[PDB]
Write a protein that binds this ligand. Structure first.
Ligand SMILES: Nc1ncnc2c1ncn2[C@@H]1O[C@H](COP(=O)(O)OP(=O)(O)OP(O)(O)=S)[C@@H](O)[C@H]1O
Ligand SMILES: Nc1ncnc2c1ncn2[C@@H]1O[C@H](COP(=O)(O)OP(=O)(O)OP(O)(O)=S)[C@@H](O)[C@H]1O
Lengths: 432, 432
């Protein structure tokens, strides 16, 4: 109903920006327009580089900048939620003083925005050390210049902040809605979840982690309907599909993965591919391939022939459009939520799925736009190794040397309802 | 993998048995075989009625009973999870002493069961007073005998327990996995969620409440395919369907409901029915009617005719069996989880859905067996008013005086693959 401001709270190197990023994507992915407002960003668009002195309490000159940055950011927050139609604005900054939060609660009150706080609390020198190593050594601020000096300036930077740090108080802040995250998710305290969005966020946040691992995404081996250029259905693996299943298992074994979890759909082709691994795996009805409704099992030609208007309209909006009695990519994404969440909770996991399902998952992990999503390239017999990294995720494409047919169909240059068959089928790949 | 024991912790009249009940059902509903072990039950199968003195600390005689009851219960817990294949055994008792819990953690350790604690903490005389009013005045113990004396004996009963009460300690119990619920869900503290089942439980528990409200379940008004005796599809409302939509709105208005929330599917018939109310409502793709795959839009006759083996096998296991390219009731239930949860978070809500969807929802709220579920009677143009009550839920069937066709098809006496058409269609209701 009314927009929301999610307020990050915590000392530097507590993973606020990491949590800001992840949550923002998650929410956006499930249909909630969210944007992050990072103060550190604003700051750099202001003064500049050198010292932790800029963070010194006596530095009144510095405090104005930071104060003007906070208000600039709020300006943006307002027009984002009030004029641009955003749903959630995440305020990413230390916000360590009751004072600062009040400023915020105030602004919120004025504009009628609900407020939820996320406080990341961690007092393990180890954890913080790694955080600085991991993300601060290469922060823009520290144009990779110094050595251990970066640490020096940062530990100091933190200290500045430790001075007036006023954590959310269970008594004084009793009325506020928030979640305190302790020791990278070991313990949590949740107070006053007001609504859906908040019940949701708490859920997401209490289910993500920072344990290094890899996510391998791939489709089932080439299927009989694949070879025939027909979409959907529940065909089994082709000979080539069966060969890939074992090339995959060979690859997986070569990766020397610690306790790998395997997920499949309830569809035969993914299950059969899983069997090749000789390890237990789990089936998820939610990973089944998108459903084409009336075009289930057709060839693009038969679709152009029987449902030409649908065909062109779908090409006009592949993300939202549905074939009669079928799902849209938007639909699939919604249905995939539970899986995405399970993927967050897992460490090393291999997911054997389908072309459309896989596009959704990649779009999620690689932050592609919904516009982009229905068109990602998910070739058969190719493994995509996803390695999450602080704010981000690298990806490696690994072809497993077993030929298969090509199922990627690019957007035709002509998507008009009155376009002609050839114009509508000119991007269809060769199928047997 | 290994079973789990969920341990209820808390003073009497904190809603432990209420939480035990709800969670057990929830879990069972989502595919996790859970059973409750209520000690109060065991006790009554032992000594008997009269005093709070049975709960007096000096009462060593009483303590043995209670001690033998706890071990009896544990015996059962073991054979339930170790021989009967249960997945979660919920230990419902005060378990207010570190001692008692150790006994439990011990037993657990011995048998290799994971352990999670749920501590209900509430220090509002008001809240507790109502609880005693609400559930204790009519407890078996207090064969509705006394008046305010019941209270007397109960407040005293609680006191006995207050003496040695040792809440979970954030330091001493740091290693344990648990969730502390404060003031009927206002604040929560979660420590060390180990796995899926636990991440799940926390979610459920942090999303249910005890605010009195009603849940109205009904189908869309009679549809065109309804009138034709055809299943599935996305037909619109019949004239009668359109008349019911407004009889419904009339009824809803007559109930004088405070802020009623309305949910529909993405299917036309439920949406059209919603329109009649003149209030905003929300569409949920997950409420769409079960999908019949290849029998989508057929009449039972056409199904018997084209897929006779499927037809009989489905009659053999209507819950698990799937029509080619279609869902099973089991499937539907899984897909409905998100909705059930949203229903828990809502207060007054009206759900306009479909025959199979509605059976699932009723089965959930009325605790019917999966065997029973696919056969519940969900007549058209009839509203089912569900009123949750402490451990339970009453239900009222309200016919809205607009005729519609009958779509209930009972299980045939003959479900053999070799049974004959007439034998397979003899329970089909009249359709136009
Ligand atoms: N709850 C957590 N506690 C501690 N570290 C975490 C947590 N969650 C994520 N991290 C780590 O935090 C690091 C990233 O830290 P940042 O997000 O830069 O912290 P931040 O300094 O609070 O963000 P800025 O200052 O707004 S850029 C990565 O190493 C993450 O693994
Ligand atoms: N977190 C909560 N705190 C306080 N009361 C609650 C809570 N959740 C449910 N209730 C109420 O608790 C009452 C039922 O109490 P019980 O479950 O009998 O408590 P209990 O006495 O802990 O259970 P026994 O003694 O094992 S039968 C109903 O009024 C519920 O509304």
């Amino acid at each position: 109903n009314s927009p929301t401001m999610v307020i990050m709270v915590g000392l530097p190197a507590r993973g606020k920006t990491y949590i800001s990023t992840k949550l923002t994507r998650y929410l956006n992915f499930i249909g909630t327009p969210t944007k992050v407002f990072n103060l550190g960003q604003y700051r750099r668009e202001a003064v500049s580089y050198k010292n932790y002195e800029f963070f010194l309490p006596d530095n009144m000159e510095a405090l104005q900048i930071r104060k003007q940055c906070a208000l600039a950011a709020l300006k943006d927050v307002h027009n984002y939620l009030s004029h641009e139609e955003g749903h959630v604005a995440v305020f990413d900054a230390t916000n360590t003083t009751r004072e600062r939060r009040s400023l915020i609660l105030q602004f919120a009150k004025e504009h009628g925005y609900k407020v939820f706080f996320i406080e990341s609390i961690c007092n393990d020198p180890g954890i913080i050390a790694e955080n600085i190593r991991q993300v601060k050594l290469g922060s823009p601020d520290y144009i990779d210049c110094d050595r251990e000096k970066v640490l020096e300036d940062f530990l100091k930077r933190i200290e500045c902040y430790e001075v007036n740090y006023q954590p959310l108080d269970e008594e004084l802040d009793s009325h506020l809605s928030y979640i305190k995250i302790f020791d990278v998710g070991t313990r949590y305290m949740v107070n006053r979840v007001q609504d859906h969005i908040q019940s949701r966020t708490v859920y997401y946040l209490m289910n993500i982690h920072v344990t290094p691992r890899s996510i391998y995404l791939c489709r089932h081996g080439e299927s009989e309907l694949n070879i025939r250029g027909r979409i959907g259905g529940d065909s089994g693996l082709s000979v080539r599909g069966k060969q890939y299943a074992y090339a995959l298992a060979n690859f997986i074994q070569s990766q020397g993965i610690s306790s790998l979890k395997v997920f499949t759909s309830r569809m035969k082709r993914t299950i059969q591919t899983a069997e090749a691994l000789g390890v237990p795996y789990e089936q998820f009805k939610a990973l089944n391939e998108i459903d084409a409704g009336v075009c289930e099992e057709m060839t693009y030609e038969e679709i152009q022939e029987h449902y030409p208007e649908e065909f062109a309209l779908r090409d006009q909006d592949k993300y939202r459009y549905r074939y009669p009695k079928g799902e849209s990519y938007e639909d699939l994404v919604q249905r995939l939520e539970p899986v995405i969440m399970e993927l967050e909770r897992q460490e090393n996991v291999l997911v054997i799925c389908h072309q459309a399902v896989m596009r959704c998952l990649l779009a999620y992990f690689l932050d592609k736009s919904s516009e982009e999503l229905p068109y990602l390239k998910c070739p058969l017999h190719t493994v995509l190794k996803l390695t999450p990294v602080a704010y981000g995720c690298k990806v490696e494409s690994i072809y497993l040397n077993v030929e298969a047919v090509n199922t990627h169909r690019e957007k035709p240059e002509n998507v008009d309802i009155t376009r002609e068959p050839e114009e509508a089928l000119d991007t269809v790949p060769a199928h047997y």
